[PDB]
Design a protein around this ligand. Structure first.
Ligand SMILES: Cc1cc2nc3c(=O)[nH]c(=O)nc-3n(C[C@H](O)[C@H](O)[C@H](O)COP(=O)(O)OP(=O)(O)OC[C@H]3O[C@@H](n4cnc5c(N)ncnc54)[C@H](O)[C@@H]3O)c2cc1C
Ligand SMILES: NC(=O)c1ccc[n+]([C@@H]2O[C@H](COP(=O)([O-])OP(=O)(O)OC[C@H]3O[C@@H](n4cnc5c(N)ncnc54)[C@H](O)[C@@H]3O)[C@@H](O)[C@H]2O)c1
Length: 433
């Protein structure tokens, strides 16, 4: 009954799917590796859940977006794993991890042993019920982290067709959700307390473009307020959203985007933690030899900024997954592996927009380009200047070359003698580098 594998990746997300591609490249043998996931499907490109998955027509659907298509790689269907002798253990939640005995136990009591462990458990979605919010347990108050959550949302959009939606949260998930609900023909109201949307990255100037663009699209942006409770009917279904300011919004469906946290509960005490995640070295190895932490759960050395960091980027999930397998196989062969040198890269898409950010959002900012929301193809960016150098670069509506140019600016940190002249140059500055 108990199963044994040389390597076990715990989790079936983006990092797990990309670690498995790296294993096949490294020559993994039949029977050696297993991926244990609580989801009923093979690893897939998570960012698709708040994008094409929510389309009313010609939506993204599995098996279409299984990894590694999101980065231009080959689709890894369930057949890809079985045909390689990679054991895909689905619908299995590991409720107990004993690192000292190298044994994991599933919710059904089944046990599994490994020689090497890769922790790719990602993040769990924050819910309003965690806060103890009045009426937050009403039906049709939905979240979006996994494909079952996406399927519940796609069912609710269909059941509540042409109704009222309230989106709680002003991050990029709130933005992508509001845009999705609007392209599905809902009356949409977006609620968040910050003085502008995407507060952890957008400047007031960048936010103003997206707020105006969403307003033109019919989305009602309600900044400076917070959802404090909900009304429900006799079936327990949400009927309204109560706000801190006394306003009461009618709602047929509520979709919440209030963040996430690393899913490291199984390891508390057994591994060193820092900055919310499991601490790793430049090779994603934890304080326990042979136990690795990749993707969302990892607090790793961010080499170019000389500090430990934790990120929630799909690029980091893929790259960190490759780094760990290279470190594991390199130790088997005595081969040296260079340190993880990640350039922070984040992106978001909604409506006909699509932006990319590289580097670090620190220092003084300048906006450049065409930032008119009514333009047929808005193309505008922003630079962050710290210690007289470009530290961060943002671009909306860039071409693949223009996006590569701002990544090279954020990677090389070119000198800025004049911030006024840098704004004059604009996007031409990134191309002339
Ligand atoms: C809707 C959505 C949209 C996003 N859009 C973007 C975007 O546009 N750009 C971007 O850069 N990033 C985006 N992200 C973030 C990005 O997808 C994540 O950073 C990435 O998925 C993390 O990879 P991961 O493997 O660490 O985590 P996950 O993909 O979440 O993988 C974790 C896996 O482990 C499983 N698991 C957890 N605990 C257990 C357990 N105890 N037992 C068994 N299995 C377990 C989970 O079910 C899941 O399969 C988005 C995320 C979401 C939720
Ligand atoms: N990229 C990031 O900086 C970041 C930060 C946190 C989480 N995430 C992760 O990425 C995904 C996207 O998260 P995000 O960027 O949308 O989250 P976020 O942390 O950036 O923002 C959550 C939003 O919800 C708002 N909010 C909280 N309580 C509220 C209430 N009661 N009423 C109204 N608004 C309320 C917050 O003020 C904020 O605007 C998630 O899956 C999460 O795991 C990303």
């Amino acid at each position: 009954s108990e199963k044994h594998f040389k390597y076990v990746i715990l989790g079936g997300g983006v990092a797990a799917g990309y670690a498995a591609r790296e294993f096949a490249k490294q020559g993994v043998k039949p029977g050696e590796l297993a991926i244990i996931s609580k989801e009923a499907v093979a690893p897939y490109e998570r960012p698709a859940l708040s994008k094409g998955y929510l389309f009313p027509q010609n939506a993204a659907r599995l098996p279409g977006f299984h990894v590694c298509v999101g980065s231009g790689g080959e689709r890894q269907l369930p057949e890809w794993y079985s045909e390689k002798g990679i054991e895909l253990i689905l619908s299995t939640e590991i409720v107990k991890a004993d690192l000292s005995t190298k044994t994991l136990t599933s919710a059904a009591g089944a046990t599994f042993t490994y020689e090497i462990l890769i922790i790719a458990t990602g993040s769990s979605v924050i819910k309003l019920t965690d806060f103890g919010t009045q009426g937050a347990d009403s039906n049709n108050i939905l979240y979006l982290r996994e494909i079952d959550d996406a399927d519940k949302l796609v069912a609710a959009i269909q059941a509540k067709k042409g109704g009222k939606a309230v989106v709680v949260g002003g991050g990029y998930i709130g933005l992508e959700l509001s845009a999705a609900l609007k392209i599905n023909d809902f009356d949409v109201t977006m609620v968040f307390p910050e003085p502008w949307c995407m507060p952890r990255l957008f400047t007031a100037d960048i936010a103003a473009f997206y707020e105006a663009y969403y307003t033109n699209k019919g989305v009602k942006v309600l900044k400076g307020t917070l959802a404090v409770g909900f009304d429900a009917n006799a079936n327990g279904d949400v009927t309204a959203v109560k706000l801190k300011d006394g306003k009461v919004l009618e709602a047929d469906i509520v979709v919440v985007g209030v963040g996430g946290r690393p899913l490291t509960t199984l390891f508390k005490g057994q591994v060193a933690e820092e900055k919310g995640g499991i601490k790793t070295d430049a090779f994603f190895e934890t304080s326990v030899p042979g136990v690795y932490a990749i993707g969302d759960v990892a607090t790793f050395p961010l080499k170019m900024y000389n500090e430990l960091r934790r990120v929630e980027h799909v690029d980091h999930s893929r790259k960190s997954a490759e780094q760990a397998v290279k470190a594991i196989k390199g130790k088997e062969s005595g081969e040296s592996v260079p340190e993880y040198d990640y350039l922070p890269y984040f992106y978001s898409r909604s409506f006909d927009l699509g932006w990319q950010f590289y580097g670090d959002n620190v220092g003084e900012t300048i906006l450049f380009g065409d930032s008119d929301p009514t333009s047929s193809k808005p193309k505008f960016g922003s630079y962050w200047i710290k210690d007289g150098k470009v530290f961060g670069a943002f671009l909306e509506g860039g071409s693949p070359d223009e996006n590569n140019a701002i990544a090279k600016v954020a990677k090389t940190q070119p000198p800025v003698a004049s911030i006024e002249e840098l704004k004059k140059e604009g996007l031409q500055f990134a191309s002339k580098i």
